[PDB]
Amino acid sequence: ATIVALKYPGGVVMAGDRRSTQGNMISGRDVRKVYITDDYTATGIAGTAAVAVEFARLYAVELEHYEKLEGVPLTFAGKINRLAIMVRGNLAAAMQGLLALPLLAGYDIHASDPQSAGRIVSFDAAGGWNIEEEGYQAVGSGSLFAKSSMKKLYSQVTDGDSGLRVAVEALYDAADDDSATGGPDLVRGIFPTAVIIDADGAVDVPESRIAELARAIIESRS
Amino acid sequence: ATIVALKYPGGVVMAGDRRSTQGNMISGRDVRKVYITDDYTATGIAGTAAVAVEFARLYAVELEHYEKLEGVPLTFAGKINRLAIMVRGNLAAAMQGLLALPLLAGYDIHASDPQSAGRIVSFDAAGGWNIEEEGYQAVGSGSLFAKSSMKKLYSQVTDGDSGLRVAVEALYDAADDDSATGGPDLVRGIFPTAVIIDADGAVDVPESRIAELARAIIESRS
Amino acid sequence: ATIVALKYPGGVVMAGDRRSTQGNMISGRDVRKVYITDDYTATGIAGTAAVAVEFARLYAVELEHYEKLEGVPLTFAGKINRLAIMVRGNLAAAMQGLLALPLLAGYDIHASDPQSAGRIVSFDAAGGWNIEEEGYQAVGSGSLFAKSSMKKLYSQVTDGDSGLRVAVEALYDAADDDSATGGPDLVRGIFPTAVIIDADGAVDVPESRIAELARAIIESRS
Amino acid sequence: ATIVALKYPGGVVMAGDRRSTQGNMISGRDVRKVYITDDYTATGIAGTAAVAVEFARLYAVELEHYEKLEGVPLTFAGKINRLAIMVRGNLAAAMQGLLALPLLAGYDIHASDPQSAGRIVSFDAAGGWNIEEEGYQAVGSGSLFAKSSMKKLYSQVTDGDSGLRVAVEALYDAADDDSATGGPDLVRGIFPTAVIIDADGAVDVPESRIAELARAIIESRS
Amino acid sequence: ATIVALKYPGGVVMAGDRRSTQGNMISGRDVRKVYITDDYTATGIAGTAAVAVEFARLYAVELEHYEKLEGVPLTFAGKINRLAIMVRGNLAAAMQGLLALPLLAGYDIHASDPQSAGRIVSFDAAGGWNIEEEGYQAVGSGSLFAKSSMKKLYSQVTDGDSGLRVAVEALYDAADDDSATGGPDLVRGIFPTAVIIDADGAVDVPESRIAELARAIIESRS
Amino acid sequence: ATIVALKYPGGVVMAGDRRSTQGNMISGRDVRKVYITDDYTATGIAGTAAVAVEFARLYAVELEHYEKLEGVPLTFAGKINRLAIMVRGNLAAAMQGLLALPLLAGYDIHASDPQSAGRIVSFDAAGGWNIEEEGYQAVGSGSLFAKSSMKKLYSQVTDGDSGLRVAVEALYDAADDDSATGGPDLVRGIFPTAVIIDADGAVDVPESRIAELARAIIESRS
Amino acid sequence: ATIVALKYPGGVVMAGDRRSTQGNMISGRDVRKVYITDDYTATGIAGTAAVAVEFARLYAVELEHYEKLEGVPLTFAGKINRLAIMVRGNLAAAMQGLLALPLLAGYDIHASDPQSAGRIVSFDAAGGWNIEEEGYQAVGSGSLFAKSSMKKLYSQVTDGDSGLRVAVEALYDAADDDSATGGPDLVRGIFPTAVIIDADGAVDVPESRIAELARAIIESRS
Amino acid sequence: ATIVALKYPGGVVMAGDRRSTQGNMISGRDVRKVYITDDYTATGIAGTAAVAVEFARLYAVELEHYEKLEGVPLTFAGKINRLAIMVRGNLAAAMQGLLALPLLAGYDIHASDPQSAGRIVSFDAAGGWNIEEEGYQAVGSGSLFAKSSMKKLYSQVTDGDSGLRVAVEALYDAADDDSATGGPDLVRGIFPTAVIIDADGAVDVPESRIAELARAIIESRS
Amino acid sequence: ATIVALKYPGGVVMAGDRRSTQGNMISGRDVRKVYITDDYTATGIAGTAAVAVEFARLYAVELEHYEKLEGVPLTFAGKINRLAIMVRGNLAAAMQGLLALPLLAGYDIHASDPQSAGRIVSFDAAGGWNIEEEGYQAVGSGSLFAKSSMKKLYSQVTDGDSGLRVAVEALYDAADDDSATGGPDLVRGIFPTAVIIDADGAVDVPESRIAELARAIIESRS
C-alpha cells in the first residue's frame, strides 16, 4: 500500500493504490484509501479499507462538529492539532500490531500567497507531525521507491495535470518495486484514486483521466 | 513461486514462473526454475535461481556419473531413490530456514503402455516421496490455486498443446491469487518457461509459443 | 466448516456445511450455521452450533429492538455498523482462542436498481468490514477451495436455481479438499442448508431441492 | 490412518485405509500401508506412503539377507526380535516428531496346532512388543473406534470371509468416527487394501471382493 | 557503505564510497572497498577496510594459484563457482554478526559479442549467486536509493564516460539519503574510487577525473 | 542532534543543528529545535521537531498562565522548578523509549551584576537539574565533541559575535565527528538556528549572519 | 586507560597513562602499557600491566624468531599481518570479557621519503586493522577526549619535542575528562611513559623530560 | 561521593566532596552535598546535586512548618522520626535504581552535658536509623577508606580545628583510594565544603580555611 | 581470611589468620594458610586449609623438580612465570565457584642492592600478576581494612621486629572490621602464623613471639 502527495502551483494532489494483502495472499483489489474530509482537506491511511474509512469518518465528524458548535471552521493549525491528538491516542494499540499512519493534504485559504497555499503533513508512530517543505511525500510499504521516483520527476511539475501525471508514475514505480502495492490492472480496469485540492475545494478525479494517464505511461515504458 | 506438472496422452509437461522475492520486495524477474536433468527427466525447485540450478547440477552429475561407471542408465525407481536420498540429507538445514522441495517429471521408456509412460513425483519436507495418480501436481506458494484451477481444466487435455495451454492458465491463476508468483509481463516480454518430455526426450518449449498462448489467455479473460 | 455466498440477478444465496470437529474427531453431523436475522438479511458464522445461534440471536434482538423503539428499520449501512461494533468488541477473546468471523448477506430495498440490490459483507479479525464486488465470498477452513471453484463456475449463474446449484457444488469441492468440512451424507440423508433472499424476503430452502441438486452433482462427478 | 488385524481359524487378516493428511488438508487418496514382507508375514505402519514402503523394504531386505546367508528362514521369535531392534533404534527421532509404530501379522508354520497358528504383534513407542491374545488389534488415530467395533463383532468370525467382512466393517466405523481415516470412496472407486495369510502363504485380496463387501455394508447401514 | 556497478557498451564500471561507521560515529574517511582481483575482474565488499582487503587478497591468491598450477586461467563460470564456495563457507559467522556480501564485475573474453561481454554477479546471505540482466546493481545500506537513481539515469549511458558519470551520481544520491554512506568531501578532497574493465583489462580511474565529475554534479544540483 | 549554549559578557547564546534521523536514514533536513519560551528564556530539546515544539509550547503556556494570574512573572528559580517538575513527570515514558532532555538558557534581570546575568541549566534523565559554572554546555549525540571543541575555543569569547562564532564552530565539529548531526548544507542553503538573549530580551539570529559565519569557518578549514 | 600516538616529521611518538582500576577502585598507580617490541616498532595495549607485558612479550618473541630463522627482519606489512593474526585469534575470549585492543607505532626504513616513514596502525574487536592517515590516534576509555584535543593541537607539531608536548597535553585532557585515566601525580612523582621512534630506532623517553613538560602544562592551565 | 561526620568536645562537624559521575565520566566538579536544614542540624546525601538539594529542601520545609504551626521546634527524636518516615517512603524507588541514603548531624540543646551534645545519625536502605556512639561516621562509595582513616586519626581531635583537619584528611584518603570521590583541585581552586554546629548554631566553614588545611595536608604527604 | 605481606630493610614478612567459615558458621580455628615453598619464597592463599596446602605442595614440587633436572634453581622471574601459568590454568573452575588467589613473597639473591631484595607479587582472577612497589599488600575478605591500617602504620617499619608488629596489628584491624577473619584467641591460645625471609632464607616465626606481640597490641588498645 502506498499513498503519494505532491504540491503544484495553485494546489495539491494526493493518490493511492488499490491493493490489500494478508501476508502473500491478495485479499482486495478495489480498496479506496484517500477520502475527502472537509471542503479543503483530504486524508490517506496506508492500510485496510475499514481502517481508512473509519479514521476518515471520525475525523470528518470532529471537524464538522466544531464548525457547527462555533459557527466557523478551524484554522489549518487547529486541524493538525486535532489529528495529532487522535493519532497519539493510539500508540499502545499500534505497538500491539494495529498501526495507522495518516497523511494529510490541504489548502490554506488564509495564506497571503495563494499559489503556495498547498500543505502536506506527515505523522510518525509516536504521534509527531511535520509540515513538509520539499514538495512531495509518500507513506506505506513502497514509499521509498515512490519518493526516489518523485525526486527525479518533480522538475516537470508546473500545474495540476503534470502533478497528477507525476503522482501516477510514482505509484507505478512503487508497484514495480514492491509486491504489496498493486499496479494498474488493465484486464479488470481498476486504477488508482486521486483527489485534487485547489482554491475552489477538494474534488475527486474521474477514473477515465487516470486511466488515460496510466495507459500513456505504460506505452512509454514498453 | 509456483511450478506445475501435468500428464497428457504420450508425455508430460512442466512449467514454472519467473519471480523471486525478499519479503515484499521483488528481487528477480527472470528466474529459471525448471531444468532438464537427463534425456527423459526434468526437475523443478520452488526457490531462488541459485538453489534450483545447484540442485539440478548435482542431480545431473550423479545420474551421468552412474551412467558412465555402469554402462547403462538407472531405472526410474533408481532415480527416484537417489533424489530421495539427496532430499532427505537436508532436513536439519531445511528446518534452519533453507528448505528446497523438488518436483520431478519424467518419461519411463521401459513401460509396456507408451501412452501412459509419463510420471510425476513429489517430495515432502521429511524426505518422503509419492508417485501421483490424478494427472497433475503443483509446488510453491501458489500451488493450491494452481491445483484448484487444474482440477476444473484437466478435462480439456487431449495432447501436448492442450496440456501446455492448461499449464500456462494454471500459472496465470496462481499469479492472480498470490503476490509471490509473477504473471506474464507484457511490458518487458517475460513469460514462464516450460519443458515437454515425450518418447523422443525432453525439450525446451520456445518462448514465442508460450507468448502466444499467454496472450490468448489474457484476451480471453478481458 | 465453510459458508459460501453469491449474488445472482435479483437476489443473493448463502449456504453452509453441517460438520463440527474437536481436533480430528467428528463431534457433530447436523450443525446449522446459517440463520435468518431479519426480513432481508442472513448471517453465517463458521464455528460451533452454539456460537452461530447465539451471535445470530443477539444480532436479531438488536435489530428488532431498534425497529420497535424508532418505528422504522435501520438502513443497510446501519446494520453493517452495528454488526461491526459487535465483532470489534470481541478481539481479545478471539486472540484468547475464541474467534468468530461472520459473513453477512442481504437485500437492499432502497437501491435504485432492484436487479443488483443483493449485498455480501465480510469481516476480518480486527473487526474491519468490506462490501464485496466480485459476486461471491466464502469463510471457514475450506474457503480457499470454495472460492477457487466459484471463480470457474460463476459464469453459469443467471438466476436463483443456477446460483443455488453453484453454491452446492462449491461446498462439495471444499469438502473434497478439506477434512473439517463435511460433504453430502447419503447414508444418513443430511445435506447443506441454504437461504435465498430476494425482493420478497429471506426464505429457507427446502431440504429436498438441495438433496436433488447434490445427487445430480454426485452422479455428474461419477 | 488405521490398520486392523484379526485372527480367524486357520489364519490371520490385516487391512488398512487409504488416506494421508497434512493437518486438516487431504494430501493423498490412494496410500497403501500394508505390505507383504515375506512368505508368511505382513507389516502395517500407520503413516505416510513413503514411511510404510521404506520400513517394509528394509525389513524385507533384512529377512531375505538372513535367509540367504544361513540357508534357513528365521523363526517367528527371531523375526520379532529383529523388528523390535529396528523399532527401538528410532526413539529419539520419534520424539523429534517422526514416530512410526508398526503392526505385524504372521503365520507360524512350526506350531503344533495349525488352526491357531496365526499371530499378531504390536509395538509401543519405547520399542516394547506384545503378542496379542484376544484375537484382534488396531493401530492409528481411529484405533479405539475400530477396537470397540471388533469387540462387538468378533463373535461372528468363523473363517476367512467372515474375518475379512468384520475387518472392513471395523475400518468403516473408524472412518465414521475419525476424520483422519478415509472411508470407502464410491465416486472414485477406492477401497481399503487387505492381506490374508494362511498355511499356503500371504496373498493380496483382490479389489472387487473388498468392493462388494463394502457395498453390502453400506446398503446394510442405509 | 554502497558499491554500484553498471554495464556500458564495451565494458563495465564499479565504484564505492569511502565511509566506515561504528554506530553513529564516523570511524573512517578514506576506506577503499573496490579491488582489482585479476586482469579482468574486480570485487567490492560493503564493509570495513580490513574485510574488503582480506577477502580480495584471498580470492586473488586462489585465482593466481590455479593459473600457475594449470597453465591457463579459469573461465568466468569457474571464478563464479570459487567465489560462491568462499561466500557459502561463512554463513554461521555471518549470522554471528560478521556478514560480508560481495559484488563481482568482470569482462568475459571468450564471449562471441565483445560489446556485451561485461558481467555483473551478486550474492545473497545463503551463498546464492545471480548473473544480472538489467545493466546495473548496488549493494550496501544505500543500495535501494542508488538503484532507484540508476533506474532513471540508465538511458543516458552510451560509453565509459557516461557510465562513470551515472555511477558517481548514483553514489551521490545514496549519500544524500542514507547517513552511513559518505558523500564527496570538498574540504578534505576525498572522492569515491572507481574501476573500469574493458577488452584491455581492469584499470583504476584517476582521482582527478572523479573529482571533476563530482564537482560538475554538485554545481548542477545547486 | 546537538544543541550548544555558552555564556559571554552581557548575555547567552544557544544554537542547534537541523537533522532528524530514523536509524541510518535521514528523515528531516530543516528541523528547528531551539524556541523562545518567554521574553528572557529559550529552550532546546535534542529530538524530533514535534517533541521540541510541543514541549516548548506547553512550557510557554505555563509561564504565561502564571504571569496572567499573578500579575508578575516568575523568578528564575521558579521557572527552573516548573521545568524540573515537567521533566520529572516523564521518567517512565522516557525509559519506555521516549526520552526528552531539555537545555535551558536565560537572562536573570534581578541579578546585581548585569554582565554575568546569563544562565545555563541542564537536566538529567531522573529529572535532576544543575546550574552550570564553566560557561558552556551541550546536549545530544554529538555533545561530547562539541564540549571538547568549546573547551579549546572558549578563550576567544569576548562578546556576542565571538560567542556566536564559537557556537557555530562547535556545531561544525560535532557534525564532523557524529553522523546523526547535520553540518552546514551549502547546496540547499540550510544553516543552524541560533538565539541570543541579553538585557533587551531574546531575539532570533538572522540566517545570513549564520551563513556568513559558517562559510568563513569552512574556508578556514579548507 | 589511554594510549596516544602521533606522527611528526621524521618519526612517531607513543605515550600512555599509569592507572589500573577494578570498577571504581584504584588498583595500580605505576602501570606501564607501552613496550618496545623491536628496533623500529612499539606496541600499546589499554588494559592491565600483565596483559600488556604478555602480549608484547609474545609479539617480540615471534618477530625475533622469524629474524633468526630467515636471516632478515620482516617487512612492515608482514609485522602487521602477524599482529592481526594474533589479535584475530582472541575474539571469543574478548566477547567473554577479556578484550585487548592494541595500537602499533613504527618506522618504515624501506620507504622512499624518510620524513614520512612513521606509521600508526589500529585494530578493531573483530581483528581488522587500518593504517591511519590523519597523523594521530588514541585507544582506551579516554580516547575520544584525547582525539578531540589532538585535533585542535596538531597544527603546532613540527618536530619531536612538539609532538611529545602535544601527546602529554592530550593525555592530560583525557585524564581531566575520564576518571579511569590517571593524571600526572605530583605528590608521588609518577608521570606518563613515552617512546620515540626515528631513523635511529626506538628509545624510551627519560622521566625528567616528561616531568618538566607536564609541570609546564599544569602551570599553563592554572 | 563521600560525606564524613565526627564529634568533638562541644559540637560536631560534617564535610563532603564535590564530584559527580556518570559511570567513568566526570559530570560535575562543584557539587554541594551538605546543607543546613535548621538552626542546629545539617544533612548530607551522597548523590547528585539535585537529589541532595531537593531532599534537604523538603526536610527543611517540614521542620519549619511544624515550628510555625505548634510554636515550638521539634525535639531531636521527633526530627529523627520525621526523617526516618521520609527515608522509608522511598524503598521501592530505591530498589528501582534511585537510592538516597542521608547522614544527619545535629546539636541537642536540651541535653544535660553540653560538651557531649553533638549527635550523628545514619540510615540504612530499609529505612532503619542508628545513633552512633564511636564519634565518627561516613557514607558513600569511599566511606570504608574514610572510616579506616578516622579510626587511626581520631585520637588527635580535641576541638573544632582538629576535627575539621581530621575530616579533611579523611576525605583526602577516600579520594586517594576511590575514583568516584574527587580530591582537592589546586588548578581550579575547588575544595570540600564543611559545616560546624555548636551551642551557637550551624555555620558554613569559609573556603579559605579549608584551602589552607588541604594545602598543609598535601605538603605533609609530599 | 586475610594474608598480609610487607617489606622491611633487609627482607620481607608474611602473615595470615586462622579462621575458616561455611557461611556464617565457624568451621575451623587452626587453619594454616602461609607455607614455605623453597629456601627463599613463601606463598599464601586465602581459603580453606586443603586448597592452601595443595597449591603450595604442587608449586614446591614444580620448583624442586626443575632444580633437580637442571642443576640450578630458577630465577625469580621464572618462578613468577610458573606460578602465573598455574593460576591461569584455573579460571573456568574459579568462575565455577572455586577461586584461589595467591600472594607470593620472596627474597632475590641476585639483586645488586641486598637491602631492597625483598619482593611481593600479587595475582588477579584472570591470572595477571603485578610486582608491588608501595611496600605492602593484602589479600582476602579483610584486605581493604588491613591495607588501610598498613597505610598509616608503615612509617614505623625500620627492621624485622617492627615489620612483624605492624603485620600483626594490620591483621588485628582486619579481624576487628570483618567477621570472616579471626582475631587472636586468648582463651584457646591460637595466634596468627608468620614467615620471615631474609638473606639467610625463609624461617617460621615461633608462636610465643607472635603471642607476646598480640598481647601488647591488645593491652595498648584497651
Residue numbers in the entry:
A (entry chain O), B (entry chain P), C (entry chain W), D (entry chain V), E (entry chain Q), F (entry chain b), ...: 1 to 222
Please give sentences taken from the publication describing this entry.
While the overall arrangement of the catalytic residues within the 20S CP is essentially unchanged, we noticed small but clear differences in the structure of the 20SβT1A variant. This results in the displacement of switch helix I by 4.7 Å, which in turn shifts an upstream β-strand and short loop containing residues βA46, βG47, βT48, and βA49, which form the back of the S1 pocket. The altered position of switch helix I is stabilized through the formation of a new hydrogen bond between the backbone carbonyl of βG47 and Nε of βK33. Of note, switch helix I shifts by 4.7 Å in the refined atomic model of the 20SβT1A variant, while switch helix II undergoes no structural changes in the consensus map as this represents the average state of the particles in the dataset. In contrast to the βT1A variant structure reported by Li et al., which was crystallized with the β-propeptide present and adopts the canonical state of the 20S, our cryo-EM structure of the 20ST1A variant lacks the β-propeptide, potentially accounting for the observed conformational differences.
The Mycobacterium tuberculosis (Mtb) proteasome system selectively degrades damaged or misfolded proteins and is crucial for the pathogen’s survival within the host. These rings assemble to form three interconnected compartments: two antechambers formed by α7-β7 and a central degradation chamber. Stacked β-rings enclose the degradation chamber where active sites containing the catalytic triad of βT1, βD17, and βK33 proteolyze substrates.
